[PDB]
Amino acid sequence: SGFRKMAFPSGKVEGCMVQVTCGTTTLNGLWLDDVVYCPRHVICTSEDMLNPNYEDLLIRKSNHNFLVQAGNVQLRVIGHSMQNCVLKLKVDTANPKTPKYKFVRIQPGQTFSVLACYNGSPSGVYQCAMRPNFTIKGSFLNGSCGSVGFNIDYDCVSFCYMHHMELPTGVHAGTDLEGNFYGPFVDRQTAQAAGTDTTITVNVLAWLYAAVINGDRWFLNRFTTTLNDFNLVAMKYNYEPLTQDHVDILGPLSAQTGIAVLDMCASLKELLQNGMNGRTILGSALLEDEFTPFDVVRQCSGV
Amino acid sequence: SGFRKMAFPSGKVEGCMVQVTCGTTTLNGLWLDDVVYCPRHVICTSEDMLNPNYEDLLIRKSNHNFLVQAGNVQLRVIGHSMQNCVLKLKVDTANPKTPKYKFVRIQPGQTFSVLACYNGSPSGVYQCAMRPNFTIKGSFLNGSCGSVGFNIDYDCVSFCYMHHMELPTGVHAGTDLEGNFYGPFVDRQTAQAAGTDTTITVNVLAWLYAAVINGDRWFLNRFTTTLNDFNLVAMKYNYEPLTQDHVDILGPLSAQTGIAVLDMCASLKELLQNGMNGRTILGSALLEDEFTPFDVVRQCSGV
Numbered sequence A, B: 001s002g003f004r005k006m007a008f009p010s011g012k013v014e015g016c017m018v019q020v021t022c023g024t025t026t027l028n029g030l031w032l033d034d035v036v037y038c039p040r041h042v043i044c045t046s047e048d049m050l051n052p053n054y055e056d057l058l059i060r061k062s063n064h065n066f067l068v069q070a071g072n073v074q075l076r077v078i079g080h081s082m083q084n085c086v087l088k089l090k091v092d093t094a095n096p097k098t099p100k101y102k103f104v105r106i107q108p109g110q111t112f113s114v115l116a117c118y119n120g121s122p123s124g125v126y127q128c129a130m131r132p133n134f135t136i137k138g139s140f141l142n143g144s145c146g147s148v149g150f151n152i153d154y155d156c157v158s159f160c161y162m163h164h165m166e167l168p169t170g171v172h173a174g175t176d177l178e179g180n181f182y183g184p185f186v187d188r189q190t191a192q193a194a195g196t197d198t199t200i201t202v203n204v205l206a207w208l209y210a211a212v213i214n215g216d217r218w219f220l221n222r223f224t225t226t227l228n229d230f231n232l233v234a235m236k237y238n239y240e241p242l243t244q245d246h247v248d249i250l251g252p253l254s255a256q257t258g259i260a261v262l263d264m265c266a267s268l269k270e271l272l273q274n275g276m277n278g279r280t281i282l283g284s285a286l287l288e289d290e291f292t293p294f295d296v297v298r299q300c301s302g303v
């Protein structure tokens, strides 16, 4: 038992991290088969960054302008192309550590592991959720762009994020591995705002089930509510609406604990209206919404 | 910027995880050079577990009773010996992925990354602190024993933990890689209690500095206190005493923020006496003590 924010083991992704240099700018890149993927603004100069015309900038480059380093070994670039906000560099060597992989775009409310890298060298791994407003609450410093986010299913790495930007509020924005931004952001040196955010209701309920499985029961009550009346309270507290599919997804956790989803919703309503009264749930003094139902089942099945 | 609980990249340790089977019992093991390390109670039968005489149990074993599997490839055991609560199995093949490593025992208050493994296969990575009472608040299921904890410095993996037990309270206990338990626990199928725990004061202060670096300032005040008077308040709230070495260790963070350690102590005293008044620090509604000063500097230097 125990419930901890947990990342996927990162070794399969570590074996794919390289360093891409163009001019004086060096970013992280992702080497899969004979292609390296990196943020396209590696081709920018300090003068270009306010509003680059990237098509123009890249037409003015050739293969020999890109230095790709995999460890101490330099990779020969033999082709280049634009992939929305990602640059694709064809190299003459397929990565021998390429895992089974795919490129999958995730939904707000889903989680993934981030492998933070600096100078092509992995530095830390952590978990985070795609917020409803398409930002992530990450931890990224100068030099981190091109770090990727991913999930692992059996042997397959599903890459879902490459890092590009930090907003003025200190949250982070990036693209899928096709170079398409999550949310209304652009890869320019400008201050950009996200939309208002909301709390991921289905994840809060999943985490309350995790708590019960781990012996935290003080917030439970004999009461139940209806879906409509729950969502009336949810809207008041800036919580997302709960769907029947959300209920159905919570079915297994409901069955494991013997607590109907709408019974747990009555606990959440009381927590939202009354606070915690100085108590904690799974070591937190607030309602946590960055664990999916899948994340919970992965740590709590069989407890 | 941003501050997230962050583990070390796990790939160097992933390349060392194997599976050790004795009889019907299979545990995780750690393969470094030509030695596999695992919890000694892999040799136990259901009848032996209440109070095994491990010396007797192991004398009754020979090399061919141990099946070591590294992936699909079986490793030939050519020697065995007892190492306190760890078994050492000599195999005929040195692990070609052995990283630079050492075995280091950590102090309460220090942090490390855990690579949770089941059936020799890595499943998740997370960070945790050795509590003052020598337990860890982990996430471990049936089948997890032999999973290890570690820190990485440059290229060197310092292994500090191998997992053995879950206490009745749901916290976890284990040994260093020499097989010596952290705390007053024994490897028997018995319910065991830890000593009372305390809050790691120096880590709370480190995390308050992390908060300031990340723009959370509401808890600051123009006041300062003395070390003696702070520790009088700390003792009241079950916080560890703050030493001058703790102050000295916090020096860099003090210099980066321009906030004297004893000035921050006055903020902590007010937080301890007044609570948060419904506000958060770095996304938490309680005072967090599982980040060391080193952990903070690693994410906040240069912000």
Ligand SMILES: COc1cccc2[nH]c(C(=O)N[C@@H](CC(C)C)C(=O)N[C@@H](C[C@@H]3CCNC3=O)C(=O)c3nc4ccccc4s3)cc12
Pocket (backbone or CB within 6 Å): A025, A027, A039, A041, A042, A044, A049, A140, A141, A142, A143, A144, A145, A146, A164, A165, A166, A167, A168, A172, A186, A187, A188, A189, A190, A191, A192, B001
């Ligand atoms: C007036 O401009 C602002 C006003 C208010 C907030 C702001 N934020 C950013 C902004 O984020 N810019 C992007 C770059 C843009 C072009 C996508 C950027 O620096 N990305 C970083 C990751 C950042 C660093 C800090 N923590 C992070 O996550 C990345 O590593 C990259 N470095 C470089 C360096 C050179 C060339 C490319 C890259 S790409 C600008 C900005």
Ligand SMILES: COc1cccc2[nH]c(C(=O)N[C@@H](CC(C)C)C(=O)N[C@@H](C[C@@H]3CCNC3=O)C(=O)c3nc4ccccc4s3)cc12
Pocket (backbone or CB within 6 Å): A001, B025, B027, B039, B041, B042, B044, B049, B140, B141, B142, B143, B144, B145, B146, B164, B165, B166, B167, B168, B172, B186, B187, B188, B189, B190, B191, B192
């Ligand atoms: C009346 O006995 C209790 C009363 C109240 C609380 C209790 N806790 C334990 C207790 O923890 N036992 C140890 C084993 C002891 C011998 C060190 C144990 O099961 N370790 C697990 C990791 C545990 C599983 C649940 N989550 C965890 O972390 C491990 O994987 C191992 N599995 C086996 C299986 C067979 C042989 C060896 C091992 S070693 C006993 C106990």
